[PDB]
Amino acid sequence: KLVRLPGLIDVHVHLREPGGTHKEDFASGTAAALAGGITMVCAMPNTRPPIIDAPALALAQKLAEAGARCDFALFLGASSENAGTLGTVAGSAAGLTLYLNETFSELRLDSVVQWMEHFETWPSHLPIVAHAEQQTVAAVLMVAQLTQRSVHICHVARKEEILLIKAAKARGLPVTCEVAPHHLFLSHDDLERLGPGKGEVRPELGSRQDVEALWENMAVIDCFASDHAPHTLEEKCGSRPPPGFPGLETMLPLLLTAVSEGRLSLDDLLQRLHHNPRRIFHLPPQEDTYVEVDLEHEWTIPSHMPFSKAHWTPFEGQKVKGTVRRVVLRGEVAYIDGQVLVPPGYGQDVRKWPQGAVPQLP
Amino acid sequence: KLVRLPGLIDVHVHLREPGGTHKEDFASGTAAALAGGITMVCAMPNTRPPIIDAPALALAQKLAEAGARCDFALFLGASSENAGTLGTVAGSAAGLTLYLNETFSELRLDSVVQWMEHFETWPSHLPIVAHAEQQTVAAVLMVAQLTQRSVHICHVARKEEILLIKAAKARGLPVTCEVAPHHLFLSHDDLERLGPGKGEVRPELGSRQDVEALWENMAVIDCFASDHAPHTLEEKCGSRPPPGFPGLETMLPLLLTAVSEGRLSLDDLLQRLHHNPRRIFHLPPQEDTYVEVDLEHEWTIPSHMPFSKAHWTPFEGQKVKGTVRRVVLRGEVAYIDGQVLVPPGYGQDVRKWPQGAVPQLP
Ligand SMILES: O=C(O)c1[nH]c(=O)[nH]c(=O)c1F
Ligand SMILES: O=C(O)c1[nH]c(=O)[nH]c(=O)c1F
Ligand code: NA
Ligand code: NA
Ligand SMILES: [Zn+2]
Numbered sequence: 001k002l003v004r005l006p007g008l009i010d011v012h013v014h015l016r017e018p019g020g021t022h023k024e025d026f027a028s029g030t031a032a033a034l035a036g037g038i039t040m041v042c043a044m045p046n047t048r049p050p051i052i053d054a055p056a057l058a059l060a061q062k063l064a065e066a067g068a069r070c071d072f073a074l075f076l077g078a079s080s081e082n083a084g085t086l087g088t089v090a091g092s093a094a095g096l097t098l099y100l101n102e103t104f105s106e107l108r109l110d111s112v113v114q115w116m117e118h119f120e121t122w123p124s125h126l127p128i129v130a131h132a133e134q135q136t137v138a139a140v141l142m143v144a145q146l147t148q149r150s151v152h153i154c155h156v157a158r159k160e161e162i163l164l165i166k167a168a169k170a171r172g173l174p175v176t177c178e179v180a181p182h183h184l185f186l187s188h189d190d191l192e193r194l195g196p197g198k199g200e201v202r203p204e205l206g207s208r209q210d211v212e213a214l215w216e217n218m219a220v221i222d223c224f225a226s227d228h229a230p231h232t233l234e235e236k237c238g239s240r241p242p243p244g245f246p247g248l249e250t251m252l253p254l255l256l257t258a259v260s261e262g263r264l265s266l267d268d269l270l271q272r273l274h275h276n277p278r279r280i281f282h283l284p285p286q287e288d289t290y291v292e293v294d295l296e297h298e299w300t301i302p303s304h305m306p307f308s309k310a311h312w313t314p315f316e317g318q319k320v321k322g323t324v325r326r327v328v329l330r331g332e333v334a335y336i337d338g339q340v341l342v343p344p345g346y347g348q349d350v351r352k353w354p355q356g357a358v359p360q361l362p
Numbered sequence: 363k364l365v366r367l368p369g370l371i372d373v374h375v376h377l378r379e380p381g382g383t384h385k386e387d388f389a390s391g392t393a394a395a396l397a398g399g400i401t402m403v404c405a406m407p408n409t410r411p412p413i414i415d416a417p418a419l420a421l422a423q424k425l426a427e428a429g430a431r432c433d434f435a436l437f438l439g440a441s442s443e444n445a446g447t448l449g450t451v452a453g454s455a456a457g458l459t460l461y462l463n464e465t466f467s468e469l470r471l472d473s474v475v476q477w478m479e480h481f482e483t484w485p486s487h488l489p490i491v492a493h494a495e496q497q498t499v500a501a502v503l504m505v506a507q508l509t510q511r512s513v514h515i516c517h518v519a520r521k522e523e524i525l526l527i528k529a530a531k532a533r534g535l536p537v538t539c540e541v542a543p544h545h546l547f548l549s550h551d552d553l554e555r556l557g558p559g560k561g562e563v564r565p566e567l568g569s570r571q572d573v574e575a576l577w578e579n580m581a582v583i584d585c586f587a588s589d590h591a592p593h594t595l596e597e598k599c600g601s602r603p604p605p606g607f608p609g610l611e612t613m614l615p616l617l618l619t620a621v622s623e624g625r626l627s628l629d630d631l632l633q634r635l636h637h638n639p640r641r642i643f644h645l646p647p648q649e650d651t652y653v654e655v656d657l658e659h660e661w662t663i664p665s666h667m668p669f670s671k672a673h674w675t676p677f678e679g680q681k682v683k684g685t686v687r688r689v690v691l692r693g694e695v696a697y698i699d700g701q702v703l704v705p706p707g708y709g710q711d712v713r714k715w716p717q718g719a720v721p722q723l724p
């Protein structure tokens with residue numbers, strides 16, 4: 001007996017197109033999404049060129065419309081030069097992404113004053129997400145308060161960070177957060193097996209105490225999101241390993257295993273992969289869209305999942321219980337038992353749907 | 363310029379049919395809903411007969427399918443006799459309602475042990491809501507913890523109650539709550555004008571400090587819901603006034619006024635009248651459904667709104683800014699500038715839609 005779930009949403013993926021298409025492209029990354037039970041993705045802007053201006057967004061929209069197999073929204077990225085320039089295209093984006101720790105020079109902000117300028121100029125009704133680790137979480141929360149608006153914290157990975165967010169929520173501050181599967185299911189204990197190249201990720205893998213703290217503080221976690229960050233094995237094991245793990249194809253199987261073990265409920269999962277993503281990012285429903293899963297099937301994660309061009313996975317060898325059997329997207333069978341059945345281009349930009357515009361005062 | 367909102371959801375209405383149709387019926391109460399920008403309602407079970415068994419639910423489903431103009435779900439009610447008997451129909455209901463303070467004999471529970479029995483027998487994946495005032499909030503929260511599940515607290519009306527819920531959420535307990543418009547926009551200061559009959563409501567009107575505390579603790583409020591509780595003026599001013607206010611037609615205009623004054627944002631409103639109702643009650647989206655409002659039009663609430671058979675309102679004389687101009691429900695114009703344009707029977711039971719079933723483990 002299969003369980004029917006709504007179409008799940010991953011608010012944090014890197015699809016690499018334009019500019020890094022040997023790692024992933026819209027077609028392969030959205031195939032990976034569908035195979036993971038995900039029918040809508042929000043794509044981060046740290047491509048090449050990065051999505052930091054209107055021409056780059058226009059290019060990315062057309063590449064996604066031509067290549068995506070599931071529905072999507074595209075983030076814009078904050079730079080040291082673009083505050084106050086994104087007003088005409090802001091509402092067409094998923095939101096604005098601030099890279100506040102390590103990143104590429106084009107997305108680097110050199111001063112908290114630049115963070116303030118983005119919070120002051122980006123339209124107040126539209127989402128802002130931050131890559132903000134350790135004390136940077138507190139710092140960006142301060143900027144949000146000074147500018148009297150909300151912020152969403154990407155991939156919370158540490159006891160320190162979840163407890164700080166917990167204290168902020170206790171004070172009624174408008175902050176939400178997401179956690180990635182590797183910060184719930186991997187830890188420092190896995191670095192010996194992974195090795196130092198494969199194991200590179202930002203935020204880095206936490207201690208056993210970090211992992212336990214995230215589980216203990218599930219109530220503080222608004223969303224799960226993969227931070228699907230594909231790189232090839234050659235890149236991960238070469239002389240300058242880039243940080244990141246692929247994760248679209250493994251996220252739901254890992255979390256269904258946890259549900260089966262009573263670590264969280266099916267509802268807890270659907271709040272974090274469906275309802276809260278919808279409400280934080282003002283993402284529209286998808287008509288005639290659902291995912292059928294088998295919660296009984298036990299399997300072991302192999303050395304690579306079928307679709308991501310990363311062609312490796314840090315979860316290799318983990319035993320899971322839970323499988324995606326079928327996905328229907330807007331009335332068409334999109335995935336069945338390992339076969340993707342919608343072509344590149346089937347997916348659409350949800351911000352162009354009337355119901356996908358973010359409501360605002362005139 | 364009009365602002366487009368999604369279809370709003372009111373999780374707490376009394377539509378009086380069967381058995382009290384001079385106060386309201388499905389046709390009139392859902393007309394009132396549409397005129398208030400509400401496209402989906404959850405109807406409480408304290409009708410005559412009350413919805414406490416499968417035959418009564420079957421009758422109510424047919425009356426609603428024949429009379430409702432907007433979409434709906436129907437609550438079941440807990441009684442001293444029905445714990446352990448609702449398993450076959452539970453998933454067809456909005457949820458289970460516990461009347462833990464004053465109510466009619468058929469819904470009265472005489473012991474906390476009966477509350478425990480309902481929490482133990484009602485399916486663990488389905489919603490439970492409670493009418494629970496003052497210390498009863500703490501008591502039902504204890505029962506929820508003993509049975510290791512969630513609870514939703516109806517119409518929170520007091521500083522005491524919102525602070526207790528705030529402390530429970532700080533401890534990570536699974537509790538949500540709603541607040542009704544009269545507990546945000548009326549207080550003891552209005553009892554002289556209303557008089558003792560019209561002013562009767564449960565929970566009673568609070569002090570100015572109660573009202574201020576609810577506003578100050580907006581972050582703790584998950585939903586707004588009207589507690590539309592219609593009675594005729596003759597009944598409200600007679601020898602044994604029943605408690606309750608009509609509120610479907612005034613809720614959104616009152617809250618839009620507050621948005622216009624900067625007391626909460628448009629997003630804060632849409633979280634509480636759309637996204638959080640959806641996610642707490644597992645209510646499905648409504649395709650091709652939206653509400654257009656005018657935020658500029660100033661008007662004064664009259665002595666009765668056009669549709670509710672209550673034919674009176676406690677908000678008479680309040681100045682508001684914000685008007686519902688048009689409602690589209692599933693592709694048909696349902697309301698325009700005071701005219702309802704869908705007939706009784708247009709509305710449907712959302713729990714019969716495939717996407718309206720609550721997901722559960724096999
Ligand atoms: O794009 C990536 O690979 C990437 N990888 C990471 O591990 N963290 C990031 O913040 C990131 F942007
Ligand atoms: O049904 C009603 O009129 C009603 N009225 C109220 O004021 N409170 C209730 O709890 C209620 F059930
Ligand atoms: Na397309
Ligand atoms: Na009908
Ligand atoms: Zn990041």
Ligand SMILES: [Zn+2]
Nearest residue numbers: 014044227229
């Ligand atoms: Zn990322």
Ligand SMILES: [Zn+2]
Nearest residue numbers: 493516517564
């Ligand atoms: Zn009540």
Ligand SMILES: [Zn+2]
Nearest residue numbers: 376406589591
């Ligand atoms: Zn009520």
